[PDB]
Design a protein around this ligand. Sequence first.
Ligand SMILES: [Zn+2]
Lengths: 55, 96, 117, 100, 68
Amino acid sequence: GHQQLYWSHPRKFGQGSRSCRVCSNRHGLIRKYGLNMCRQCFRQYAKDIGFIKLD
Amino acid sequence: MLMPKKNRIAIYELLFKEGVMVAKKDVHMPKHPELADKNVPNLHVMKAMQSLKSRGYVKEQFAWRHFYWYLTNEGIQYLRDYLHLPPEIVPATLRR
Amino acid sequence: VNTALQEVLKTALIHDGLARGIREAAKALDKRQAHLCVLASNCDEPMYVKLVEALCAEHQINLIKVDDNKKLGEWVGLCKIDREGKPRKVVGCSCVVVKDYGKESQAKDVIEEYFKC
Amino acid sequence: HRIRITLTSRNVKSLEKVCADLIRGAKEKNLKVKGPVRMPTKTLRITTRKTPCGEGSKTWDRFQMRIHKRLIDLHSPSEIVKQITSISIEPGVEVEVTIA
Amino acid sequence: KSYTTPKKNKHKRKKVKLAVLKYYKVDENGKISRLRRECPSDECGAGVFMASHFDRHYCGKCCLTYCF
Ligand SMILES: [Zn+2]
């Protein structure tokens, strides 16, 4: 049944195991420096992490 | 509800010592990060707390993965009416 | 003494050591924790009286009898919707075998005395 | 018994100020200490799009992390280093003490 | 809502009324007796009798089905 078929697909790789950190989005991910974050909410909450824009 | 009886009672036994617990939102994971000494389905746990919120015994709010439930006076009253503890004792959220 | 039996059954329901029902009670006897249970007579039993006397008067089981089994489940609390008063719809039961963990109550000594003598 | 203090922070002005006042305190407390060894900064690049939809001019914005690090060489025992490190802390600086 | 294929229902358990005589067999005199095969494994309880089929037996929790 579904109790033993919950793990029919191994979620060890791909977009299924690597979802977004904000609202579980599956597009536009940033895996760089351990964010696992979508780009738009990174832009939304990237000013209060101790950041000022220079270039 | 499709959960074992001893697991549910152990969940409110965990909630006796505290006034809140964390739980991630996922429908394909059987493991609990907070409670690790025994097997418990956290899917059924968050279903139990959303049923408790539906009948109006506890609150619930969202922050990006996790639901947060705050026990009130009627919540601990239903706790001591359900698992049948003496009303003199209180949870440890008031020990200041 | 019936008030003491009601208090002991209710306290067993508080402590949750009893096996509510017939089949789980049969599991309890097959696991050998048969100590006390309440029987009855002149019920709606066609042949069940011989079977219940055979399972009762076999090995260290108390001899407690009531008038009928329709009020035996009232002490257990089967389906008591609206528990603050008389429930609107109640179903019946036959027997409940109790496995009480702490056998020191206020009147458990005189109840065990009534069992023994 | 040389002691190395890996001093890391988020800003450069706070890091240089903390290094300067710790050098002044080490000079005032009558101990031997080496010169300030300066390490290069880490410039950390982020290139993302700005348009939520697929229309419009393709515009980009660049995000930069400007973090520095400083390290010094001691000759004092570790108790003096501990009592000058565990006092006068500020938010934005993460300290690291490594014995040698 | 309703498919043209008929509904494939789940196995509803039949109401086997007065099955206690299927557990404790009453002899000519009042005595405990057993007729069904019990599960040899200690994982299942002693009251949990192993199921009796027409030609073999089926275990409940252990699922160790043996044949003659
Ligand atoms: Zn078995």
